[PDB]
Design an enzyme around this catalytic site. Structure first.
Site, short mmCIF file in Angstrom:
data_model
loop_
_atom_site.label_atom_id
_atom_site.label_comp_id
_atom_site.label_asym_id
_atom_site.label_seq_id
_atom_site.Cartn_x
_atom_site.Cartn_y
_atom_site.Cartn_z
N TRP A 21 -73.47 14.04 36.63
CA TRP A 21 -74.69 14.72 36.24
C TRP A 21 -75.30 14.13 34.98
O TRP A 21 -75.66 14.85 34.05
CB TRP A 21 -74.45 16.22 36.03
CG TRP A 21 -74.25 16.93 37.31
CD1 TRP A 21 -75.21 17.24 38.23
CD2 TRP A 21 -73.01 17.38 37.85
NE1 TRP A 21 -74.64 17.86 39.32
CE2 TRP A 21 -73.28 17.95 39.11
CE3 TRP A 21 -71.68 17.34 37.40
CZ2 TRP A 21 -72.28 18.49 39.93
CZ3 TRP A 21 -70.68 17.88 38.21
CH2 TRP A 21 -70.99 18.44 39.46
N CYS A 49 -77.36 19.15 34.08
CA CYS A 49 -76.69 19.18 35.37
C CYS A 49 -77.62 19.10 36.58
O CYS A 49 -78.05 18.02 36.95
CB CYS A 49 -75.79 20.41 35.49
SG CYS A 49 -74.76 20.40 36.99
N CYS A 50 -77.94 20.24 37.19
CA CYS A 50 -78.81 20.26 38.36
C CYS A 50 -80.18 20.88 38.18
O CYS A 50 -81.21 20.25 38.47
CB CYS A 50 -78.15 21.02 39.52
SG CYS A 50 -76.58 20.40 40.10
N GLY A 88 -77.73 19.79 44.32
CA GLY A 88 -78.46 19.82 43.06
C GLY A 88 -78.12 18.54 42.31
O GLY A 88 -78.50 18.34 41.15
#
Lengths: 756, 756
Positions: A330, A415-416, A731
């Site tokens: 990520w 992250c997502c 994601g």
């Protein structure tokens, strides 16, 4: 100062020259770009030479589904390893976590057990000294959490109702402003921190929030100390970063160096890069205009930087691997977006970044995210879409929704889908809770349907031949109250311990003195939950109880509406659940008063939680994976793209500020006969999905996979044929070959949109 | 349970058998003793053999004024070392800190610098690994404190206004109820702790004091874990202490084992034993009456136990050595006292303990303290006095004052004069502040008279040819406000850090769930301060300023009253100061809301602070040591014992709850022609000094030295002649030969009372 003057020569003046204000700098120096991709250069020979070498290790990884190599007797710190290269003669941007490419380090402060687990898993011997130190001398985050946990919390962890929380790995969800290094240089930042440190003296002596202010002072001292180690780290590579970057190559190197210190000291689940492409464009533009670098040289630098983001690695356990499949990192980069002043933040560098997907092929990392707006230059919209159609390696977030929500145009994605204003905000990661099992519990009076033991509050199981919606919903509401309590309590313990035993000094050193914290709670299985309510409400669901009256299966009569077909009958329920839970955790007290937020995100938790959940009212069989993030259950969204997009966008970002993840997979032809029609259509689709108004909130996120379910089946049998095949899965992206057979199984069995 | 039944067979029943209540057990099982010393036995051959061997190492220590030996590559913990003996065949009570007699350990959690300092001092090489671990991996107490300190606080530390605080050594001042081990056994205590741990769950889940309750839960988990290591420790010696002690030898061994874990894991300045003599008498009585042990065997066990308390050692730095001279340990034992029910807590064991001073000669450790009461059996009063006259190794505390203050008869003395209810209370040690320099600062506007730099708040120095009392007193009052602020702030930082980086788990594991904490602040140089006020008030003090108007000396005209001659004119001032400071620190917020308390205690700080303080108004020359604790300045109390005793007793224990130390030295003849007259007189003197009423508070403490200034002069030249010569010096005892020439200097130049 004159050092700053030399480096910043040519830059427009503003507050950013008197205080740390990266946003301002960008604001009065960046060059908006509305042109197209015709200017992009191709990979240099060194770039290809380097990348190919690296790919050899990546193949080995996917092949063995294990690290290429890792430390066994060295505790990693910012300055623990010596410089490491792929080929120092070729690299334009240097820096590796350890002394070798892809060799993973040991980040013991999180816990020594996970490390032993990893060692046993990959047949390696953990150095006895390292082990003694991190069990007897330096207490780890893991030890502290499990010393304070409650047996209830453990029961939940075991039953699969609250599992995978950050109690055995770095919490992540923190993005230091690595751009600050390029802009001001370490020294300037240290002097700034020293001031921050001193600003707390008064409160200290006056007994004002005594304990909170003592903690912060120490944290700030640790940050100041981390900054100095950053210099020492850079120095091992022959670099002096005490002063600001004087050109593009340095801005990039300086920024990466900031991030490098972070990934050398913390092993957070998500170690995102931030919003840097446009920032760095300011230095590239300047060097181009002065004829110091060519365009190909500019691309080469971006390639080498992005190449390093493709090499970030962390030693993980098998348990971790199924919770976060694909060897994810990520290293998220927020590209584009619109400024508050109407201008586009798109730059030539926005293009250069997406272009790494061509120069070095598709890659799941960095997790490049397009901050989409209906006002973006069409030239960019099309190119982004083409790149999606070409690589399935990009994701999109609604910039017309977030920019105005924060009323800030310098926020990035951690992250997502978790937004934060760079250097001024962070999240207390909380993974996600099993919402589906919560319902079963409501029906079985808190007894786990698989373990047949009491997990939730002891209560009376719902009785009758047919399930009544109102009853089931009330019991469920009660169990949600309980879930919220356990969940927040667990996170409170976790973050108190992480702050104590694994404070991310190098990252926090690149934030302001006071950082906004949110307590991000995740919801898994939203759709199986909503559909199950629908089945009970709009049909006859007949529970099949076992010898003890435990509902171990359900018989359904008469079809019912499902999530993802834009049918308000189900869709309203999902939206209701989202609201309910958010309102519940909202009342609870949290550590450091982190503001509780929610997110419909799961990562591979959809598979794990699904594996540990029995037959549900919606019809899902026991052990079957839930849908990723906020996706409808596998194959239930069969009324075309627009239908499902409309359903997911109905979900309120007003109650899920931590994000709403939607993985959208569509077959090429569904987008048009040729790529020109496909670009335009894809972009048009997103414009519609992300459409924002005071009345219509719009979608928050969107993964975009453009391919045929067949190609994957082929890939499953002919792995060596698609070494760099990348796919969006929840994601984030992953190389298809990095997944396990069971994880690939989840993918191929998912929804592949055929029409619009 | 039946295990507890077998062990406790014969004991009278009470609440203590259902809950942890050591006080109750003692209450309905102990046998009061009003007889005399005629029953005492003498040292066994093994006792003498063992002690002599040990004395060989003690000689070496005093001789080299350095440790006999110490660890260089081992981090000490409860279970780090293997069993160590003097001679396992002879020892009746076993247990040493390391594997050898007097070999000092490394307690790194407090800070790695002090250890390096000690190594350099004694020409030894610290193991590089140990050093790396405690600088890079495990942050130490020392590091945390200095990361949060203010430059002001450092200035004070440097100038000698606030120096020697517990920022470079274990804070100590904690007494775990080691008797609990003998009484219930480890297992029982662990089960009790587990309950305590669980009792906090509710509050946790409910967000009640979230952070405070999380901390406590973790602390309790650490305590529970420490208890288990205690067993493992004992096991190395071939003992199973999971169950309660079944006889005397075990009660003693079990109790010592509890303490041993503490002195193997924490290096607190004072590691006091508690109030155990009477408790242990319950097990001795039982074994005597059943004819399982003789009386000589009883004494032998007490000898071997007390012998071990004579062997407690800690590696210290030279800086530490001058702040706490004589290689002190403060293994304080509270003997005697009266119960709340009128009975005396004196037992045959009270005598056995004092008798170790005969069986093994005089010794500064353990620091045996007589809890004196006008209602004690005369038989005991005389014997205590005789032992004082014989060894000068005992101290006395007013039990008629403290027992009723706490309204508890199971409180003990930590270090010198700091009282605490065993297992239910502790102190946050704070060393002591230089009250004298505070006055000089008031006169020189906060500029240090020696360093000529600004330490206190920048203000206008007092001007004029002669000092006005009211002016000087107001400026001083203001500076005291400042002193209180700095002092409390420093302690807040210190204890927050000590709780974080060096929580005394093994000791806290022997306390209740909630422990009362006080923030003990010490006052040094009370007398030079009071006398200086008197000189200014009742005489003509003419300041001699330097080129910058800095008062570097004083000219006095006309004698003035001094502290220690029972003259209310000075005495009232001292009492006033005590009150003032106490009232000031009382307003300030403290860490963990420790209740601020005060104490007129200095230890060797009288020498250090005096060394760093210039000429004062009272006439004391620069560099001259202040009086120990609350003593009058050297030789100023020349109106006999009763006069000085009366002055010191005037000091309000109501504003110095942490204690008021008074070192009383008297020449033999001043007490009588023979020892019979001497006993009676000494005891009568104390009865008068400690006399307590609702109108007259009475004295709180009293060191008692009975010898001739000549003997010491002889000792200074003929060291090898008095190897065990012990003297009281400030609230503790030391072997005269363990002191430095400059520290002996302070002693011989002190007041030697000649009359009554």
């Amino acid at each position: 100062n004159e050092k700053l003057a030399t480096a910043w020569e040519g830059f427009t003046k503003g507050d950013w020259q008197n205080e740390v204000n990266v946003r301002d700098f960008i604001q009065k120096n960046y060059t908006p770009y509305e042109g197209d991709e015709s200017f992009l250069a191709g990979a240099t020979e060194a770039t290809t030479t380097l990348w190919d070498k690296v790919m050899e290790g990546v193949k080995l990884e996917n092949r063995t589904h294990a690290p290429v190599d890792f430390d066994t007797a060295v505790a990693s710190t910012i300055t623990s390893h010596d410089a490491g290269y792929i080929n120092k003669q070729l690299e334009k941007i240097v820096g590796l976590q350890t002394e070798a490419p892809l060799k993973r380090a040991l980040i013991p402060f999180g816990g020594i057990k996970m490390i032993e687990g990893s060692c046993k898993a990959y047949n390696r011997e953990l150095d006895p000294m390292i082990k003694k130190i991190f069990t007897e001398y330096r207490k780890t985050h893991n030890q502290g959490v499990f010393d304070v946990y409650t047996p209830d919390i453990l029961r939940c962890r075991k039953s699969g109702v609250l599992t995978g929380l950050p109690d055995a790995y770095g919490r992540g969800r923190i993005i230091g402003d690595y751009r600050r290094v390029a802009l001001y240089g370490i020294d300037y930042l240290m002097k700034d921190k020293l001031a921050q440190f001193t600003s707390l003296q008064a409160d200290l002596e006056n007994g004002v929030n005594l304990e909170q202010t003592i903690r912060l002072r120490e944290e700030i001292a640790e940050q100041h100390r981390a900054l100095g180690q950053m210099k020492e780290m850079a120095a091992k590579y022959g670099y002096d970063i005490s002063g600001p970057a004087t050109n593009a190559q340095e801005a990039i190197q300086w920024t990466y160096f900031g991030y490098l210190a972070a990934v050398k000291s913390q092993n957070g689940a998500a170690m995102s890069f931030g919003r840097t492409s446009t920032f760095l464009d300011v230095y590239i533009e300047r060097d181009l205009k002065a004829g110091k670098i060519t365009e190909q040289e500019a691309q080469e630098m971006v390639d080498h930087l992005v190449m390093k983001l493709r090499m970030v690695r962390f030693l993980r356990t098998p348990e971790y691997d199924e919770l976060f499949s694909g060897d994810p990192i990520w290293a998220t980069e927020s590209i584009g977006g619109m400024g508050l002043d109407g201008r586009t933040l798109v730059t030539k560098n926005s293009f250069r970044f997406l272009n790494t997907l061509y120069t070095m092929g598709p890659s799941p990392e960095p997790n490049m995210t397009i901050l989409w707006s209906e006002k973006l230059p069409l030239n960019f919209k099309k190119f982004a879409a083409k790149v999606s159609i070409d690589t399935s390696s990009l994701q999109y977030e609604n910039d017309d929704l977030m920019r105005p929500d924060f009323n800030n145009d310098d926020y990035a994605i951690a992250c997502c889908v978790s937004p934060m204003i760079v250097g001024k905000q962070m999240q207390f990661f909380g993974a996600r809770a099993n919402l589906a099992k919560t319902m079963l519990y409501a029906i079985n009076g808190g007894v786990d349907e698989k373990l047949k033991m009491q997990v939730g509050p002891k209560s009376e199981p719902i009785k009758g031949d047919v399930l009544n919606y109102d009853e089931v919903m009330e019991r469920m509401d009660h169990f949600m109250d309980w879930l919220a309590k356990q969940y927040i309590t667990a996170l409170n313990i976790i973050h108190y311990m992480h702050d104590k035993y694994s404070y991310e000094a190098s990252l926090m050193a690149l934030h302001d003195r006071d950082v906004i914290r949110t307590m991000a709670c995740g919801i898994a299985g939203l759709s199986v939950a909503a559909d199950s309510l629908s089945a009970i409400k709009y049909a006859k669901v007949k529970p099949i109880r076992d010898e003890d009256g435990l509902a171990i299966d359900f018989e359904i009569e008469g079809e019912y509406p499902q999530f993802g077909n834009n049918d308000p009958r189900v869709d309203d329920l999902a939206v209701d659940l989202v609201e309910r839970f958010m309102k519940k955790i909202q009342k609870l007290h949290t550590y450091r008063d982190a503001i509780p937020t929610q997110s419909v995100l799961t990562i591979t938790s959809n598979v794990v939680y699904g594996k540990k959940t029995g037959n549900t009212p919606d019809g899902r069989r026991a052990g079957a994976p839930f849908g990723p993030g906020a996706n409808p259950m596998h194959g239930r969204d069969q009324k075309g793209a627009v239908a499902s997009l409309t359903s997911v966008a109905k979900l309120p970002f007003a109650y899920a500020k931590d994000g709403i993840s939607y993985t959208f997979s569509i077959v090429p032809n569904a987008l048009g006969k040729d790529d020109e029609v496909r670009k335009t259509n894809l972009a048009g689709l997103m414009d519609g999905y992300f459409h924002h108004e005071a009345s219509i909130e719009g979608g928050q996120h969107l993964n975009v996979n453009v391919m045929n379910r067949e190609m994957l089946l082929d890939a499953m049998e002919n792995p060596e044929k698609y070494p760099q095949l990348t796919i969006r899965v929840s994601g984030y992206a992953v190389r298809f070959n990095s997944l396990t057979k069971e994880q690939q199984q989840d993918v191929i069995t998912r929804t592949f949109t055929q029409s619009m």
